[PDB]
Amino acid sequence: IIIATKNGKVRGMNLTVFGGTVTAFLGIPYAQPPLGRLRFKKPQSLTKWSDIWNATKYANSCCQNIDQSFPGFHGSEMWNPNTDLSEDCLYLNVWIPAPKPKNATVLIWIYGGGFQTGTSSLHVYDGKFLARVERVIVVSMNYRVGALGFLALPGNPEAPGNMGLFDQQLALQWVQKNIAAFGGNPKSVTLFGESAGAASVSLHLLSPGSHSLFTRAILQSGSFNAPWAVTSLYEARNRTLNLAKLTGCSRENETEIIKCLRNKDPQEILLNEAFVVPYGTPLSVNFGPTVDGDFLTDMPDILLELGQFKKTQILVGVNKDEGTAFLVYGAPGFSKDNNSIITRKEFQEGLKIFFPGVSEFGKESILFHYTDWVDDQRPENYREALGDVVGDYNFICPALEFTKKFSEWGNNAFFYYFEHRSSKLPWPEWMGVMHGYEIEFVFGLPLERRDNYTKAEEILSRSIVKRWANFAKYGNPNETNSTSWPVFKSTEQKYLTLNTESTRIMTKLRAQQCRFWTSFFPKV
């Protein structure tokens, strides 16, 4: 099994998937390894290789800090990289159905994290099911995370910012120039990603360089207008200097600061990343996208409001309990080992952790808007209240807002609200429908009947899988005897719920809560 790429040949492997076969290529390199003097620089193009590259194993994962908060716990360790870490990590994966097609539509995955972690080789990102069941080609790449991917000295090509974004862009360029040889259609390419990946996707809509490299976009629990998504030009600079000071690299010329940083062991850069910002929360993006004047020629909010982006169809949505995951990593009184009931004042110190710079007036206005109880007793009210605060502000409200303004320019947008909790979800029952736990359903994992998912979950997974694939192909997320999914329009603003019971059409998702974040919190 061998395919001819424009930089040399690559050998794949056959996978057995539901009585059929999927042709998979794991670990095709798409750029020069960013080592030594190439550290912190935009990815450089590759030269041809004479012999055969064996793409039969997942490549290295990009350098990153590892979540070791809960040793032995699957809930956290399932997100930890499952291959060796290395600065040599610019590779991608390609899955193809068997037999092979002539012009299949292509789905490209951009993994999530806080831009600090993640890799394409995770079990939940396995594209072989998607290749078998809907006969699409599935691509996923590794991109640089943390300071190695997003360190910024604006105007200076030695570390300009958004390197990790340019990695993604280079992988998309690779698909354009190579995917036809695999039987793919470069004129029908759909990006999708979760959280930071979804925000990465939304950034590709803004950036001129990415205009011609894909067709449509899917944004799961993320967008660039999320409060955590983009760092100001000034706060990025403050973090680069904090990092240099912490690494014994403080200088006067910055050209020499970068020189010093290039001599540091990767671990010394990684292990200091947490300290570059004082108000460190688990939602902190220490090094993420910034306005570099290259990938982002201007402030994202401005570009969105002026409508200077790629005009195309989008699929957008969020989970029911996006906030809970972040509460167990710092907020007081919360644990995965108890029911995590908290008191009015525990709620208050929580708000102080997630809103460090906000006045006590503002942390009271917030407390106000989220205590108009339906039931006075509970006592779980506050534990769910703080959850909803984080979730609404960090994920749900920015997403509705992004979808509203994107639709305003005459493009079809579709919005979803994912309400089902996995029967195998390793976290406690109070955390609900968590950040990131729609991903296994999008990748068709419950289709594996030997895998301890319920029948109801397989049916649901099949719907999402079908809808996602049809959206990629046709621009409309329809199924087969299935609820018709309507466009999100700024007037009526309809969205679809996804659960095992009854998939309904509804309106004005959490419009009351999002009212506060969009039209009052900015004035505090």
Ligand X SMILES: COCCN(C[C@@H]1CCCN(C2Cc3ccccc3C2)C1)C(=O)c1cc([N+](=O)[O-])c2cccnc2c1O
Ligand Y SMILES: *[C@@H]1O[C@H](CO)[C@@H](O[C@@H]2O[C@H](CO)[C@@H](O)[C@H](O)[C@H]2NC(C)=O)[C@H](O)[C@H]1NC(C)=O
Ligand Z SMILES: C[C@@H]1O[C@@H](O)[C@@H](O)[C@H](O)[C@@H]1O
339 binds ligand Z (CB under 6 A): no
Binding letters toward ligand Y, positions 474-503, x by CB under 6 A: x-x-x-x-----------------------
Contact residue for a copy of itself among 365, 476, 499, 500 (CB under 8 A): 365
Contact residue for ligand X among 283, 396, 433, 509 (CB under 6 A): 283
Radius of gyration of the chain (CA): 22
* Interface stretch with ligand X, choices 189-197, 361-369, 376-384, 511-519 (CB under 6 A): 189-197
Q: Strands 413-418, 494-498: parallel, antiparallel or unpaired by DSSP? A: parallel
- The span from the CA of 42 to the CA of 428, in Å, is 42
Closer CB to ligand FUL, 380 or 479, in the complex: 479
485, interface contact from Cl ion, ligand NAG, ligand X, none, CB < 5-8 Å by kind: Cl ion
Residue 435 annotated as part of some ligand binding site = yes
Contact residue for Cl ion among 17, 106, 151, 285 (CB under 5 A): 285
How far apart are CB 306 and a copy of itself at their closest, in Å?
24
- Stretch 436-475 residues interacting with Cl ion (CB under 5 A): none
No. of helices (H) and no. of strands (E), the chain: 17, 14
How far apart are CB 442 and ligand FUL at their closest, in Å?
15
- The span from the CA of 416 to the CA of 497, in Å, is 6
**Taking Cα atoms as reference points, which of 63, 246, 18, 300 lies closest to residue 164?**
63
267: which 2 tokens? 């671990």
519 binds a copy of itself (CB under 8 A): yes
79, interface contact from ligand X, a copy of itself, ligand FUL, none, CB < 5-8 Å by kind: ligand X
Burial of 429 (0-12, 13-18, 19+ CB in 10 A): exposed
3-state secondary structure of 290: strand
Active-site choice (140, 188, 195, 200)? 195
Contact residue for ligand Y among 14, 44, 82, 103 (CB under 6 A): 103
368 binds a copy of itself (CB under 8 A): yes
Contact residue for ligand FUL among 36, 71, 278, 357 (CB under 6 A): 278
CA dihedral 416, 326, 74, 58 (to 10 degrees): 70
66 binds ligand NAG (CB under 6 A): no
Positive or negative, the CA dihedral 257, 258, 261, 263 is: negative
Contact residue for a copy of itself among 71, 253, 361, 502 (CB under 8 A): 361
482 binds ligand FUL (CB under 6 A): yes
Q: Strands 505-507, 2-5: parallel, antiparallel or unpaired by DSSP? A: unpaired
- The span from the CA of 505 to the CA of 512, in Å, is 18
337 binds ligand Z (CB under 6 A): yes
Closer CB to ligand NAG, 189 or 198, in the complex: 189
150, interface contact from Cl ion, ligand X, ligand Y, none, CB < 5-8 Å by kind: none
* Interface stretch with Cl ion, choices 174-182, 205-213, 280-288, 327-335 (CB under 5 A): 280-288
Residue 114 annotated as part of some ligand binding site = yes
Closer CB to Cl ion, 6 or 378, in the complex: 378
112 binds ligand X (CB under 6 A): yes
Binding letters toward ligand X, positions 321-350, x by CB under 6 A: ----xx--x---------------------
Q: In DSSP terms, which residues pair with 54 in a beta bridge?
A: 11
77 in catalytic set = no
50 binds ligand FUL (CB under 6 A): no
375 binds a copy of itself (CB under 8 A): no
Q: Strands 104-110, 184-194: parallel, antiparallel or unpaired by DSSP? A: parallel
Residue 231's alpha-carbon distances to 287, 289, 470, in angstroms, are 8, 6, 35
- The span from the CA of 65 to the CA of 75, in Å, is 17
Contact residue for ligand Z among 82, 335, 343, 490 (CB under 6 A): 335
448 in catalytic set = no
Dihedral class, residue 101 (left if φ above 0, else alpha if ψ from -120 to 50, else beta): beta
**Taking Cα atoms as reference points, which of 319, 364, 359 lies closest to residue 198?**
319
224 binds ligand X (CB under 6 A): no
Answer whether 64's CB lies under 8 Å from 89's CB: no
- The answer for residues whose C-beta is within 8 angstroms of residue 95's C-beta and 6 or more apart is 22, 23, 24, 25, 127, 128, 130, 131, 137, 138, 139
436, interface contact from ligand Z, ligand Y, ligand X, none, CB < 5-8 Å by kind: ligand X
- The answer for residues whose C-beta is within 8 angstroms of residue 87's C-beta and 6 or more apart is 33, 34, 35, 39, 62, 63, 148, 266
204: which 2 tokens? 């590709």
322 in catalytic set = yes
Residue 362's alpha-carbon distances to 279, 282, 517, 522, in angstroms, are 17, 21, 11, 10
Closer CB to a copy of itself, 189 or 400, in the complex: 400
497: which 2 tokens? 């719920």
Select the residue whose beta carbon is closest to ligand Z and give its number. 335
From the annotation, which residues make up the binding site for substrate?
A: 113-114
User: Binding residues for ligand Y, per CB under 6 A?
Assistant: 102-103, 185, 187-188, 234-235, 238, 242, 278, 470, 474, 476, 478, 480
User: Binding residues for ligand FUL, per CB under 6 A?
Assistant: 242, 245-246, 275, 278, 463, 479, 481-483, 503
User: Binding residues for Cl ion, per CB under 5 A?
Assistant: 18, 231, 285, 430, 478, 484-485
Active site residues: 195, 322, 435
